[PDB]
Design a protein around this ligand. Sequence first.
Ligand code: CLA
Ligand code: CLA
Ligand code: CLA
Ligand code: CLA
Ligand code: CLA
Ligand SMILES: CC1=C(/C=C/C(C)=C/C=C/C(C)=C/C=C/C=C(C)/C=C/C=C(C)/C=C/C2=C(C)CCCC2(C)C)C(C)(C)CCC1
Ligand SMILES: CC1=C(/C=C/C(C)=C/C=C/C(C)=C/C=C/C=C(C)/C=C/C=C(C)/C=C/C2=C(C)CCCC2(C)C)C(C)(C)CCC1
Ligand SMILES: CC1=C(C/C=C(\C)CCC[C@H](C)CCC[C@H](C)CCCC(C)C)C(=O)c2ccccc2C1=O
Ligand code: SF4
Ligand code: SF4
Lengths: 742, 63, 73, 80, 153, 73, 141, 73
Amino acid sequence: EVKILVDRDPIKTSFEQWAKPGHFSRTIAKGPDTTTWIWNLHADAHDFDSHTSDLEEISRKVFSAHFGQLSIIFLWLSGMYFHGARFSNYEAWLNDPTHIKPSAQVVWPIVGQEILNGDVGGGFRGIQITSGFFQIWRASGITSELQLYCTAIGALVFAGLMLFAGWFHYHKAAPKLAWFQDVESMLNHHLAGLLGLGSLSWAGHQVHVSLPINQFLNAGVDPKEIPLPHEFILNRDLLAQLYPSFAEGATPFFTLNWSKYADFLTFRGGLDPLTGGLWLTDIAHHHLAIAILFLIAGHMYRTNWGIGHGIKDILEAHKGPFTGQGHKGLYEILTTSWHAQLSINLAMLGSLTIVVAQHMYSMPPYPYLATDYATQLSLFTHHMWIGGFLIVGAAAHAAIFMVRDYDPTTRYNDLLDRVLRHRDAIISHLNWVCIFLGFHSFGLYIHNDTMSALGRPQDMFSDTAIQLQPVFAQWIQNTHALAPGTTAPGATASTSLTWGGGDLVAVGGKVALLPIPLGTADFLVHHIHAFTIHVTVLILLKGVLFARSSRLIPDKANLGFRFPCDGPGRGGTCQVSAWDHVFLGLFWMYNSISVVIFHFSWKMQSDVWGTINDQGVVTHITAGNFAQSSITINGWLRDFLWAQASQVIQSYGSSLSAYGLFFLGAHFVWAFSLMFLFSGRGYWQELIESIVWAHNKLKVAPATQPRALSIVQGRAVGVTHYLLGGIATTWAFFLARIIAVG
Amino acid sequence: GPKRGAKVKILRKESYWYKGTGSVVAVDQDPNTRYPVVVRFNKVNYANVSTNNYALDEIQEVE
Amino acid sequence: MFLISWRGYWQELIETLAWAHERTPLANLIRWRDKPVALSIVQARLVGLVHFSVGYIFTYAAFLIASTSGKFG
Amino acid sequence: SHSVKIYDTCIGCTQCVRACPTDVLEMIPWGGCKAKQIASAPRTEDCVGCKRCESACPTDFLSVRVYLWHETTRSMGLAY
Amino acid sequence: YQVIQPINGDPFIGSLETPVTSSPLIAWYLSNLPAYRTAVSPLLRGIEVGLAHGYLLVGPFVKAGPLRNTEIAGQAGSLAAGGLVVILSLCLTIYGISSFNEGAPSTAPSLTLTGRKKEPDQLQTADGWAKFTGGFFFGGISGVIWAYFLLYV
Amino acid sequence: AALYTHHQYIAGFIMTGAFAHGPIFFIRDYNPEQNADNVLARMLEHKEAIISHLSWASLFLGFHTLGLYVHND
Amino acid sequence: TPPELDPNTPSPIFGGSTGGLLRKAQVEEFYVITWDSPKEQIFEMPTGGAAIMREGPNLLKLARKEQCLALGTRLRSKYKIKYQFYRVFPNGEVQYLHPKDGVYPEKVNAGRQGVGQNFRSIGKNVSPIEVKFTGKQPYDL
Amino acid sequence: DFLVHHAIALGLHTTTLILVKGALDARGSKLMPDKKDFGYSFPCDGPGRGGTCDISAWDAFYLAVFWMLNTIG
Ligand code: CLA
Ligand code: CLA
Ligand code: CLA
Ligand code: CLA
Ligand code: CLA
Ligand SMILES: CC1=C(/C=C/C(C)=C/C=C/C(C)=C/C=C/C=C(C)/C=C/C=C(C)/C=C/C2=C(C)CCCC2(C)C)C(C)(C)CCC1
Ligand SMILES: CC1=C(/C=C/C(C)=C/C=C/C(C)=C/C=C/C=C(C)/C=C/C=C(C)/C=C/C2=C(C)CCCC2(C)C)C(C)(C)CCC1
Ligand SMILES: CC1=C(C/C=C(\C)CCC[C@H](C)CCC[C@H](C)CCCC(C)C)C(=O)c2ccccc2C1=O
Ligand code: SF4
Ligand code: SF4
């Protein structure tokens, strides 16, 4: 019987706990004897499992926490809209999107930083933004700064509401555990109410506000001269002038004469030639269909009426000869353990962010986006990074479940057990396939470097020597290019210009998109991707599968999820914990994503982006050198890194100088991590002994005894500074490069 | 030996509080006890311990 | 690599590889005389430092000689 | 095998013995401390050298000490 | 019914019995391989193994080698294959010298799956391994020569 | 250039080695009693002073050199 | 007191894994742990996976002594059940290991002679130079 | 020249900090008063007492090599 369950006033609201650091932990609440205390206070702050054993209290904590997060995000959006209204060149940009650089940040004039306010156009001086907000705002039909202001106020209000909701649902009316456990209902409401009504109502805004205003903008009429959005709702005559379907109102909808609505609900595909973005009509139709799909999907699970599936039933129905009991027991696991859920959701959300990156490069959804190379590069890189991080997190919390929540005596599952019983085979096979992949991908590169160095280019792996064609990908390309004529008749063009066949979409003299050629170089990089991903998976999966025990450490589970080791014995057992596997997996994720974004950058600058001359002459940014240059490590070293770092290294004395500063700073932080990664806390402790002596000599030794960081924190600081450094380096490199030569 | 609550200097070289001062808690009268002098310290060691046993020749009553 | 990743990870990995070898037919006929284990902690530090130093020296030597002799001042 | 030694600063809290994962240490009668007992290491052939015992010892300095010595198949924690 | 069972009924031996490991087709296949002819002279086994391996070895050397696009492709590739045959024979030889003492008996299993006693494979002896290596060399070179003949004569 | 770089790196390694056989002496050979109150034992006496002052020097130089460079940049 | 005898008692219910014995059990040594369970119940295997201990006598062969003491520790701590374990050599010989004298090593028991006990504080160890060119270590005195 | 010379000063002082500290604490420290009983080179002393990675004099050398390479760099 699914219903609203809530406890009234579980926790009194008082600043008393604010004045007592570490209140959540009986150990930390006692106070500091050494400095280590401090770090612990922050490390275990959000580890609610180590706070209480009660699943209910934890669930409440996470719920209000989520409200806090949403509040923060609303405040963030509020900031973006407000800065877009008060400190930007957005209207000017609307007047001329093809020759004005998007800027929504200005700096104050002190210590010379005024130079950062550069000539972005529109009679405005500031920092060029690469978030892509301007194209969103144009797509939403926003024309004035006033509307941006109003959206900012709305977002601020929503921030207040989310914060209050957090306080309310923690201190005043806190849901019961059964409420959180109503997964059938939660799934129904999230499928139908969130996504369904979300894309439905959004389709509403698109059909009533986006389409008309954008039609006007594309027509060329001055934005101020364009009718306000509410008028298109009040006066249906305007929409009728733009799309005659509205003359018949909602009649063809109910009478099933949907063909009449082909004016604003299309299925053309490809890109709009005068904007370089997907057709907004296609987008509106897309959101309508999606809305229907999710709406019907949200009626799958049984709640307070007979109809509907039971999750446990569907799970217990799937069991084979190879797997025995199958998915039985998983419902209980996934309705009592937050870490399992977090694992699944992190893996899938990360993967989703990755697919978002790819789909947004290859099918530009916003007007004047494809030709804003800075924005595209930025979006791709950003979402790729977010994805990778979320995935590593999925590994972490999978392992955390494996150590803290797994209990085969009370919550047994056959699949998990069987996985555990042949983990050696799984990990060994992953190992082998990783070595094979490494050899047969990187080894090709080294082979090429050697042959090239020895004066034997005819012995290389390339398109002009020993060819390794991506036949399968080429076939998929051709198939997807010929699809509109055969297997998708209702579609006018392809879903993306990047497919093997097609024309070329250009906007304002710049290339928006064109068919992307795939050769030996692409085979090579793709197999590098497969390799790096496989290694990352090797590390993480090994980490979670051996989190509880191994032949080396039979009782590793009792040591916890996060611990440095089990001593120098057994030959040495450093980094045996699953946490340390998350730690190594982070480095490998960094590696993989780095080579991925380099792949994207070089390929785009070489074979896609660039200017287009009259009669159809396309001049790319790096003139198609990829196919010949990316086949050796030296090519990446010289033609990519060395050649393209030019913009960042000579950005001094201009508006892009901050990128030079960040280039150097990031290199510095990266190197700085190596001190932590390469060393150990014993040395630091003894050094600290000497320094402490010096402080005692002058009566200035603190009561909170100065301690070297723990082994684990040394590792965490190490990997954190390593990632921050490397990623920020590629950040500065990318942005300076693409902003200067774009 | 020294009295209870007596401030003593540590003479055991391998002690965390070597050359430092602590307070006497109790002295074992059993002559078989090799380290009778129970001492407590103001600061904990690397093992989070604030108390330790010493012998008669490992403490020096000072003030 | 040798400087950042430490022993236990590799030891367990190698354990799974040992199982792998003892359970692979044909290859089963071949067996090691010295049990495969991960390098020791100190050994790891030394080997890592060695790769680091060699890389350091060789890289800077190549740059020095090439940049200088490429133009000869 | 590794070497394990007990020193007379031992106060017989037995923490090290119940910390060993391979049953190397044990408690024997003694008169040097109030607990009437002291630690002992009769089975160092099974010692792996993890040093959990040393991490369990309260005394300052340690009353149990592990000197990693000659390396054997048992001390390497091998199962193959 | 279930597909995966403990190895030979023993659930505490570090393996599992799957269609890949133990099914009639694969079992028959492996048991008929020269390596598992546990009751025959290791010499003949060596001849077969070396023959097959040298024969396959001729392929990739000829087509992928540095002289693949020259009139002297077959000679070069086959020679290289013979070279690898020699090197691998050297490897096999030192493996035999290092692993087996002339006095030491067979290290091969002396039991079957059923649990009955049987004569240990003489492949796991010094003399037996030496014979196997001789067979790998003879058969290896012979296989290289034969493949080269079929390919270029 | 080759000669200068060569001899400076050789000199560096040789120096680290000097300071490496320094403590090997302190561990394997040094006899505290036979060195009672001499310059060496007295050296071990105020070790904290030596180490802490080296620490101060390094700290100062680092803060100010990095600081001045970053300033100029 | 005489050590416990080692008969052929039934093994726990388990589908088998890849974490069990290897060649080391055949050529060097393996181990055997026995216990007496009040009922049929699930326990986690030291080598990974879940097994069912039967009621009465149970005998499990493991690859390492550490695995044995681990499992035994989990038995005594979680299931409140006494355990023993032995080492077994390929020739057939069995060596009784734990608990050695019938009493857990945590609690004192008369009869045990000291091994490796130095009657001196740890700081009073001689410097390495005192033992140079001898076979002795400063902690062997 | 001034700036880079002070960088060199930083390098020398820091490298000597590592090496000297490693030499003087080679016999022992408060974290490990009996270090001399373990020798010049050993893995560590274990995760106990807060953790003792890179506590041997050999490890001090190993750390110092990075700073020498940096300095001569
Ligand atoms: C994440 C969102 C975000 C970010 C990164 C920024 C960033 C910026 N804003 Mg924007 N802003 C935002 C949201 C954001 N804003 C929102 C939602 C609004 C609408 C209210 C604004 C309205 C706004 C205006 C009107 C201006 C800016 C300006 C700026 C710039 C200078 C900031 C400054 O120096 O403040 C001033 C610095 C301080 C106030 C420092 C005081 C910090 C105190 C001492 C900390 C005390 C700690 C305590 C716990 C915090 C208070 C808690 C409180 C509950 C009591 C900077 C780029 C300026 C600008 O861009 O000029 C060209 C500017 O004029 N912002
Ligand atoms: C506004 C009045 C108010 C007061 C007096 C309290 C008081 C309390 N809360 Mg409550 N709560 C409130 C509002 C309030 N809350 C709101 C608005 C929310 C929704 C977020 C919550 C949700 C909540 C949860 C889930 C929990 C509490 C808990 C508590 C108790 C301990 C928390 C603590 O002391 O750490 C004080 C925390 C801070 C001072 C840090 C604030 C962290 C902010 C909000 C995160 C965002 C910072 C952001 C990342 C900025 C970083 C910038 C940059 C440096 C990176 C204490 C009685 C805890 C409890 O009862 O434990 C048994 C507990 O678990 N509260
Ligand atoms: C889906 C979101 C999500 C949520 C809710 C959690 C929640 C949790 N994680 Mg998980 N995790 C996630 C994603 C998430 N994680 C991701 C994406 C990764 C990959 C990096 C991980 C990898 C991971 C590890 C390895 C561990 C956790 C742990 C935890 C638990 C304790 C967290 C804590 O208290 O730290 C307090 C929060 C902080 C200390 C924040 C500081 C983090 C760094 C310093 C900030 C980075 C700098 C920033 C980018 C820029 C700085 C700019 C300027 C300030 C210099 C908590 C249940 C820990 C645990 O024990 O679980 C039981 C744990 O050991 N997580
Ligand atoms: C790791 C990737 C890789 C690959 C695929 C190649 C491939 C090649 N190299 Mg290159 N090489 C590499 C890395 C690689 N190299 C690196 C890293 C370097 C720098 C050290 C070099 C330096 C180098 C030089 C100097 C030369 C080559 C040459 C060659 C060519 C001839 C090689 C040869 O004769 O071997 C013989 C080939 C084999 C023995 C094949 C064995 C593998 C088979 C397929 C295993 C089959 C297993 C089976 C599928 C499993 C199931 C069994 C079941 C069916 C029964 C060949 C195209 C030569 C050339 O001129 O190229 C044009 C040459 O002169 N390489
Ligand atoms: C480029 C990377 C890098 C940097 C900057 C350092 C820096 C340092 N190391 Mg070295 N170290 C490194 C790599 C690095 N290391 C590597 C790869 C190894 C091999 C493992 C070592 C091994 C090592 C050893 C063995 C020792 C050192 C020591 C030192 C310190 C020497 C004294 C000094 O110069 O103080 C100047 C301080 C700095 C240069 C640090 C910068 C401080 C910044 C500029 C101030 C704050 C800026 C700003 C306000 C911060 C905002 C951040 C925000 C998030 C709040 C110095 C902090 C020695 C030491 O600790 O002596 C006391 C020492 O004994 N390191
Ligand atoms: C952007 C943004 C924002 C804003 C937002 C908005 C503005 C929203 C809106 C929203 C909306 C405005 C929504 C709406 C919705 C509606 C709906 C969802 C409706 C539905 C309906 C229906 C579904 C119907 C049905 C029916 C039919 C069809 C017939 C029969 C009868 C009935 C009636 C049942 C904020 C500030 C937050 C923040 C920042 C960002
Ligand atoms: C200016 C001038 C001059 C003068 C000069 C001089 C006088 C110089 C000096 C210099 C010097 C004066 C230098 C020094 C250096 C030193 C060093 C470099 C040291 C090192 C040390 C060590 C290495 C140590 C070792 C050890 C240890 C650690 C332990 C104990 C033992 C031993 C000792 C072994 C003249 C007039 C002539 C000319 C004009 C100009
Ligand atoms: C450098 C380094 C340290 C030393 C780093 C430390 C001790 C970090 C602490 C440094 C900060 C600056 C101390 C905290 C300062 C206080 C907050 C006081 C602030 C004073 C105001 C002026 C800001 C380790 O402890 C360590 C441990 C394990 C492996 C590697 C390493 C490692 O590489
Ligand atoms: S982590 Fe530090 S302490 Fe733990 S084992 Fe590796 S080295 Fe020894
Ligand atoms: S080291 Fe580990 S194993 Fe050896 S004795 Fe101390 S605890 Fe037992």
